[PDB]
Design a protein around this nucleic acid. Structure first.
Lengths: 90, 73, 246, 105, 137
RNA sequence: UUUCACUCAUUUCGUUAAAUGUUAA
RNA sequence: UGUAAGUUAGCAAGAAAGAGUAGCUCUGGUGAUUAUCGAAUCAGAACUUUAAAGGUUAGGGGAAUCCGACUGUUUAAUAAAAACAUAGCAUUCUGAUAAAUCUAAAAGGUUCAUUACAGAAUGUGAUUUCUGCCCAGUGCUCUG
RNA sequence: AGGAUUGAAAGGGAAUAAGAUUAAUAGUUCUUAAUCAAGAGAAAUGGUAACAUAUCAUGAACUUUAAAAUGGAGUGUGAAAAUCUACGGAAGAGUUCUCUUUUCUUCUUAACAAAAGUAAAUUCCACUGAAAUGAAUCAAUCAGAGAAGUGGAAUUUAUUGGCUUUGUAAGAAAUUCAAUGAAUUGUGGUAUUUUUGCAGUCUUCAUAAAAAUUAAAGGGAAUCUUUUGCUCGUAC
């Protein structure tokens, strides 16, 4: 179908090769389904910027703008768990 | 307008004191007994003449009875 | 000349906020005994989209602890919150994501959000998408704690200022390149009237101080004192530096 | 084809200005005022359209018979059957656990 | 055996959702007409109301009265509990069998009031509590 | 005069002015 | 049927270029119900003539150079553009009792139902490649 | 108990239609047929369940939920109407020295209700437990937090209950005939368009009103007939 322009072929030829490259990575990750942390199904789809809904599970999760869990949002969750255990133990 | 389905209701309707007027219409294939009550206009589609004559004896004599045929009154 | 566009902006005309479909004021609940010396539990009924802001809002529902009924609150979502989650607000709350704790109970290194600059003022700092403030240190001598603002500045607050543990949802919003002028037009649907910005050098000398002559240029330095009156304060204000940074 | 005219004085294709063209005696067509499409009730928790209740205007529920505006069950008009089974289990199981864990462990 | 006569269950579905019932007869296989594992339960349809010492003796009688129900219920719609009543105390329950239940017709009112009085008089003695206290969802 | 400590005018806030402070249990 | 150089590899492209098309008489393909019933659509063959899209409706095409990247807006009544906007790039200030800013004043007002992924003030104008040297003069600033 | 006034003849909103009538007004008058609001004369059953019962079958304070009340695009399809068409006709009209079993017109039905017969789509319930993985769409999409199958329940489809049908109702209206009175008023289509719904799919750094007003729920306090419906606009 296309050599390399997969999802950004809808932009035609009118935004710049670099900008169409950057927007491609975001638009793929924004439209893909993610593994839903409470029922382990590939059924989470984005409904708005920062709101994700498990289709076959009935849960609404707050996440990143385009990805369900951001890199900065995962390290923070890990950091708090370490802090909480240390506080709870002496 | 409401329709009366069988014979028992119309006689009980006729003996009931809420009636106001009766008009009998003779069609080519049936006879309709439209009882004009206070609220609704109950009718009864009849195809047997003997049952119709029984009905015609059932109307109280004081009631104005209207006979309707191929020419409207 | 005329009154420039920055002067016309403070009059509250067409430049008013387009806040008709907004959900409401997003903040912590009012302080009370049950938050000062206990923990109240809230239920995240739903997560909604507030027009004009990049983060989702959680429709948290508390229980009235002094009367009969419900206390329907409206929080700013911390990343990871889900519908049906229980969140506890108080001084004795556990250190979990989404819980509301006074900033004195958080261990040094805790990442918080929606912090109160003054006790009981229901949230000031770290409210944009993906933003957060870190706790630097405590000082029990004067009941003050140090936090690091998202701008990098350090601020000292009272140790009883509340905060929400975690990261504001909706991070990475501004990394997606707008491609079209139409998309930027829809960005200000629930914002103020600012978008199509005419360069001052394209204006006329009456309209703007940059309003130029036979060649589009400025003519005078664009770095100006802080004390310049409204009307001539156009460009860089109190600029300690200029040019590309190294 | 017979062309028609608005009978009321409204002249714009608004949501409340819906019309239907029906045939009448002699081939003439008349204009009816049709009714807007309404939504039903939703479970207070899961937001699912409840079964057994019609989708009519709010005032018309008053005209309906007493039994036609609800369902004979616990909470019976505000919660689905699933929404209620969870409520019963939550009440019983948590109270039972609160009875064994604390209260003479 | 989880479901045995005398075992207290809580109904999960139907008109009697949330009512506490006592199992009488168990059939996990199902008869010809009943294609489901069913149990016949007698329970408290209307729980008794609390009384104080300001109301007359006739008011205390009617406020402590219990209205009961007998119903064939699927075993998938009842959650068994850890409480068991003594069928000897509630002897009238022992006469509730599957044959007593006909399809489509009203259950005998005289029988229900007889069990209701036995439930009421037993409750007035306070010997059984968790069966007669109401479940708050 | 400068550096301190307080609040009592004064500023900025928050609520349904809904357990503030100190004893007591 | 056939289609080039160039290219951000998406386009160019209806590129360019060539052939067919009428009337009449027929043939075949595409289904439903279980022999009957039904749909406009496609393909093919003899014959005839005044040789067939053209009554009406209905793209001229190609090779280059300059400017603006594009879609959009503009001097109502002589300028529609290379001008304005634009996305992208960059710089400055501000931790909210703030920044910008309206008012004669004000428990006054706007961005702000907001909180640095934010608010306000500017220059250049998509993408690719790159932004060299100069702090003397005038500005701005200094944690002095 | 909680916050004053005004702000929409295109937003929300209790309830009406057909025929006839005037030189001119008609969802407004007349005939016939309806609807709405406000009044007057120890407390129920059935179903395993989803849920169902001509008013029925008590339900106060207080609290909650839902409705009123929600973008756009595109594809599929249910139903109605218009046009076209198949079979059978009845009445009238046009062409006719050349033919034409021919060409043209009419063959209709309201609000409000009823329930012979019978649909499409979606969501739930019971039995059972799927792998050799199956089920399905134009596309999708779904399943051990349970598919497919069988049997059920509910809602939507321009009023009751969607369509044919019925009451209203043929007594009206249309087409003819006679001089007010007489005749007829079947059944279909795997066709096009329009309208109105439904189901999923796509899109947003856009998420696409509020209140009056209504109903239900949790809680257990207390022990059919009839009257009236005012003010203003209404011609063109």
């Amino acid at each position: 179908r296309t050599k390399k322009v997969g999802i950004v072929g809808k932009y035609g030829t009118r935004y710049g090769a670099s900008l169409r490259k950057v927007i491609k990575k975001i638009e793929i990750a924004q439209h893909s389904k993610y593994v839903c942390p409470f029922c382990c199904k590939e059924a989470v789809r984005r409904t708005a910027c920062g709101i994700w809904e498990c289709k076959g599970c009935g849960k609404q999760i707050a996440g990143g703008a385009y990805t369900l869990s951001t890199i900065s949002g995962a390290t923070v969750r890990s950091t708090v768990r370490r802090l909480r255990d240390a506080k709870n133990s002496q | 307008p409401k329709q009366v389905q069988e014979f028992k209701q119309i006689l009980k309707l006729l003996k009931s004191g809420s009636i106001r007027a009766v008009r009998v219409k003779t069609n080519g294939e049936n006879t309709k007994f439209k009882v004009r009550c206070a609220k609704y206009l109950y009718t009864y589609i009849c195809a047997d003449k003997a049952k119709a004559e029984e009905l015609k004896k059932a109307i109280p004599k004081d009631i104005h009875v209207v006979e309707i045929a191929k020419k409207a009154p | 000349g005329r009154r420039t566009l920055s002067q016309r902006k403070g009059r509250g005309s067409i430049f008013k906020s387009r806040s008709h479909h907004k959900l409401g004021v997003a903040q912590h609940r009012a302080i009370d005994f049950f938050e000062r010396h206990s923990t109240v539990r809230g239920l995240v009924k739903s997560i909604e989209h507030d027009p004009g802001r990049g983060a989702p809002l959680a429709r948290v529902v508390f229980r009235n602890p002094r009367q009969y009924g419900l206390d329907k609150e409206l929080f700013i979502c911390a990343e990871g919150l889900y519908s049906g989650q229980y969140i506890y607000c108080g001084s004795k709350a556990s250190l979990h994501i989404g819980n509301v704790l006074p900033i004195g109970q958080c261990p040094e290194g805790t990442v918080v959000c929606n912090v109160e600059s003054k006790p009981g003022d229901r949230g000031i700092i770290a409210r944009a998408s993906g933003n957060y403030a870190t706790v630097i240190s405590h000082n029990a001598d004067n009941e003050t704690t140090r936090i690091r603002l998202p701008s990098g500045a350090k601020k000292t607050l009272k140790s009883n200022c509340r905060a929400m543990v975690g990261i504001i949802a909706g991070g990475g919003r501004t990394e997606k390149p707008i491609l079209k002028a139409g998309v930027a037009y829809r960005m200000y649907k629930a914002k103020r009237t600012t978008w199509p910005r005419v360069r001052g050098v394209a204006m006329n000398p009456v309209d703007h101080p940059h309003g130029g002559g036979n060649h589009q240029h400025v003519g005078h330095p664009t770095t100006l004192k802080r004390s310049s009156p409204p009307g001539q304060k156009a460009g860089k204000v109190a600029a300690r530096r200029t040019g590309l940074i190294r | 084809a017979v062309r028609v005219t608005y009978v009321r004085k409204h002249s714009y294709n608004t949501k409340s200005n819906g019309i239907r063209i029906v045939k009448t005696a002699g081939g003439n067509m008349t204009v009816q005022h049709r009714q807007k499409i309404s939504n039903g009730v939703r479970c207070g928790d899961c937001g699912c359209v409840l079964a057994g209740i019609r989708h009519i205007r709010p005032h018309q529920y008053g005209w309906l018979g007493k039994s036609k505006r609800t369902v004979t069950r616990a909470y019976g008009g505000v919660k689905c059957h699933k929404c209620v089974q969870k409520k019963i289990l939550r009440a019983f199981l948590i109270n039972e656990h609160n009875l064994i864990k604390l209260a003479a462990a | 055996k989880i479901l045995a006569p005398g075992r207290v269950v809580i109904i999960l579905s139907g008109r009697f959702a949330g009512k506490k019932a006592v199992v009488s007869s168990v059939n996990l296989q199902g008869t010809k007409d009943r294609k489901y594992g069913f149990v016949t339960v007698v329970g408290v349809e209307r729980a008794p109301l609390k009384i104080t010492r300001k109301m007359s003796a006739k008011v205390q009688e009617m406020r402590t009265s219990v209205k009961s129900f007998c119903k064939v219920i699927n075993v998938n719609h009842v959650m068994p509990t850890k409480y068991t009543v003594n069928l000897e105390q509630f002897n009238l329950i022992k006469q509730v069998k599957i044959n007593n239940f006909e399809a489509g017709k009203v259950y005998p009112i005289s029988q229900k009031k007889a069990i209701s009085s036995q439930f009421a008089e037993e409750y007035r003695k306070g010997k059984e509590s968790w069966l007669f206290t109401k479940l708050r969802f």
